[PDB]
Design a protein around this ligand. Structure first.
Ligand SMILES: CC(C)(COP(=O)(O)OP(=O)(O)OC[C@H]1O[C@@H](n2cnc3c(N)ncnc32)[C@H](O)[C@@H]1OP(=O)(O)O)[C@@H](O)C(=O)NCCC(=O)NCCSC(=O)CC(=O)O
Ligand SMILES: CC(C)(COP(=O)(O)OP(=O)(O)OC[C@H]1O[C@@H](n2cnc3c(N)ncnc32)[C@H](O)[C@@H]1OP(=O)(O)O)[C@@H](O)C(=O)NCCC(=O)NCCSC(=O)CC(=O)O
Lengths: 392, 392
């Protein structure tokens, strides 16, 4: 096949940054190049995902032009891809493909957005407009996921309080991350008594609006060692995708994460027991609950109980959530770290790399994980992208 | 490695159709499935390009959902890609890649838009907004290409009248195509005396706004024969290259030559083996650069290539013989129609018509065995080239 690694990582801060999407993208890319010990001229491709704050025709080309990558010497392949929040991992798979087919020896993958700075009114309008023809009441995306949550409750007996436990657990993780937007952990009642957004979905269960950008540099192992030289630059062991409808009608074969996860495991010749860090998309509680089931951390229908077990162990440990007992989204995820539209799957990757390189600080897993699984989700369970990262 | 064919083609009409983008996409896909002797359930992937008339989050997913592809039984991979008007050929390359890596045995590639029905005011605003930060005066895209045209005139001695000859030649082709929006050929003076859009670019030299959709079905040769020549051509190769989204000017900015060269090497063919060319012609300078890039004439001689054909046309009783100018026999973006990111599809469909001997009064004799198609995005920002052959 040929071994391909994430050789560079760079990102901006997260929050209300008062910067343009182009500035954030450019800053993230520069950080990534420094992290890779590379220069602009060493890049042979660039892949990006669209922005909601600043929608732009041929986004990747726009970013590349403004950042001053042109004119280049030799070949440069640029591409914008849209699979929603699955994008960054989708783009990762494409980057691997460009390397293996020898279309490009090195690839930059960039995601950038500013949905907190854009204002609540504009965000709500554009995010709702994203689900035309769905029949979903506003806000549409939360209502779409809420409809799947209610189906889980009816089908599998998922409890309302088990959904609400997700942001509690994520807030416990987030408060150990210096940059996470949530710096104080929630109580279960606080989540349950927060503003109602949809019948079984409250405000503190919604993905947290943020500005932010992340850039990844992908390269063949051999090429990188020759010119620019484990866990800090992990091997992309596999990437797999699967898809579903953009909005709900409900049958279990609609969900695509399990198929994507299974294909990623087979591709990498690994199993769930070999993975000791999980960066799992958590735009709403039902997404994370379905994710842990899909990747095989627990049986089908037992995701809610998986959350409750961790929540109870947290309460019986003096309110402390031990990462070793819940090695998932140690950064806080979309719930409590932040969610810049199609960006935040990048934070599953960056947090995985931090853990694999033993640079996650107070969030650090012990023993150091050798292998990580990351998961990005787009639309309303419409796009699944799963990748497995290994140190060696 | 493994032979992959375009096994189905379907499209709507072209013009002012008064239909939604979703309706056009859905209609084109149904036609393509019938043309492939396939059903929805036989599709394992769908790739699409964004629409200007109806911009939509996760466009491919949106189209797939509204068209009723879900729920699916097996795996289904959906993806939206944006490389401007290069898109359809970019997507074609990705489809081939999905087949070869066995992620999907069959792939639908769809492009749909309605930029004529959307209204002149909305089109102008959105097309201009596409070039933020460029510094180009309105209309921005024509002015961007106009700046490159002026550079060609200064650098290579390209004549103003040679630019204007492009729509003349395209209008001669278009009037032989029943559905082409231009049904009466232009004179050179008529082009030169038409409304000025940019210093060296007039109205009849601009890409013709149209509504339209096209859908392609891609499949491995062996898989298709088990379950379901020129009419279903082999995708011999696909190659891409990119450049800045807008101008500052150096010759290494242009990427079509690199893309063309890589496609030829990939396919193990040369320009002399190709007897039909579907070349992107959003403005005269694009086609002039295209014929040079693919090797139909030397660098800087594209203007003279047009004049030679124009003069031979005048000395042949005003008749443009396709055998002496086997290029865009449909009329291209200039005179067939240009639905934003769609019209590279018409280079593919016209190529297939020629290869299958179903091009009517436009038919090349002898029947071409091999065709080259070229899509261009932005302002010489994206190049996508593919070579189609009837048999090995
Ligand atoms: C919930 C909303 C309808 C309305 O929230 P508002 O922005 O109006 O709230 P606000 O900022 O005005 O003020 C509310 C107060 O609570 C805080 N607050 C706001 N949102 C919060 C959240 N998610 N979690 C925790 N706290 C939050 C604010 O800081 C503020 O605090 P104080 O007042 O104390 O300062 C909206 O945020 C929304 O639509 N959220 C859903 C996001 C979404 O759908 N994302 C895409 C998921 S799909 C995906 O992930 C990928 C893909 O694109 O496919
Ligand atoms: C030329 C324009 C500025 C002006 O268009 P208007 O809508 O104002 O046209 P109008 O109102 O003057 O039209 C009045 C008459 O002229 C005709 N007419 C209109 N446009 C024409 C054209 N291009 N060629 C020939 N005739 C044309 C109409 O049929 C009508 O006929 P009658 O006389 O019978 O009434 C615009 O169409 C334009 O921007 N065109 C270029 C589009 C573009 O840049 N596309 C992207 C290219 S880049 C690319 O392709 C790559 C990528 O996408 O990335």
């Amino acid at each position: 096949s040929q071994v391909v690694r994430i050789v560079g990582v760079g990102r901006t801060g997260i929050g209300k940054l008062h910067k343009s999407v182009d500035e954030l993208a450019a800053s993230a890319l520069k950080c990534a190049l420094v992290d890779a010990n590379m220069k602009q001229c060493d890049l042979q491709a660039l892949i990006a995902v669209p922005s909601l704050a600043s929608p732009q025709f041929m986004q990747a080309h726009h970013i590349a032009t403004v950042a001053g990558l042109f004119p280049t010497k030799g070949k440069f392949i640029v591409r914008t891809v849209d699979t929603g929040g699955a994008g960054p991992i989708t783009a990762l798979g494409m980057a691997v493909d460009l390397v293996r087919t020898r279309c490009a020896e090195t690839v930059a993958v960039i995601a950038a957005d500013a949905v907190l700075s854009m204002g609540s009114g504009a965000f709500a309008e554009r995010s709702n407009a994203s689900l035309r023809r769905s029949g979903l009441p506003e806000p549409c995306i939360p209502h779409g996921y809420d409809r799947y949550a209610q189906w889980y409750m009816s089908r599998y007996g998922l409890k309302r309080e088990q959904l609400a436990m997700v942001p509690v657990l994520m807030s416990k993780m987030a408060e150990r991350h210096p940059e996470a937007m949530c710096q104080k952990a929630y109580t279960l009642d606080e989540v349950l008594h927060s503003r109602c957004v949809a019948p079984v979905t409250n405000l503190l269960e919604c993905a947290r609006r943020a500005d932010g950008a992340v850039a990844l540099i992908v390269s063949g192992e051999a090429h990188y060692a020759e010119h620019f030289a484990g866990g800090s630059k992990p091997i992309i062991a596999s990437v797999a995708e699967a898809s579903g409808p953009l909005f709900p009608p409900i049958v279990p074969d609609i969900f695509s994460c399990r198929h994507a996860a299974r294909d990623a495991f087979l591709s990498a010749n690994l199993n769930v027991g070999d993975i000791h860090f999980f960066g799992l998309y958590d735009c709403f509680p039902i997404c994370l609950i379905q994710a842990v089931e899909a990747v095989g951390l627990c049986p089908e229908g037992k995701g809610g109980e998986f959350m409750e077990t961790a929540y109870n162990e947290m309460l019986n440990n003096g309110g402390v959530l031990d990462p070793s007992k819940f090695p998932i989204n140690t950064h806080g995820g979309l719930q409590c770290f932040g969610a810049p539209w199609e960006v935040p799957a990048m934070y599953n990757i960056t947090e995985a790399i931090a853990q694999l390189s033993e640079e996650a600080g107070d969030r650090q897993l012990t023993p150091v994980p050798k292998r990580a699984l990351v998961y990005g989700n787009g639309g309303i369970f419409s796009a699944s992208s799963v990748a497995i990262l290994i140190s060696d």
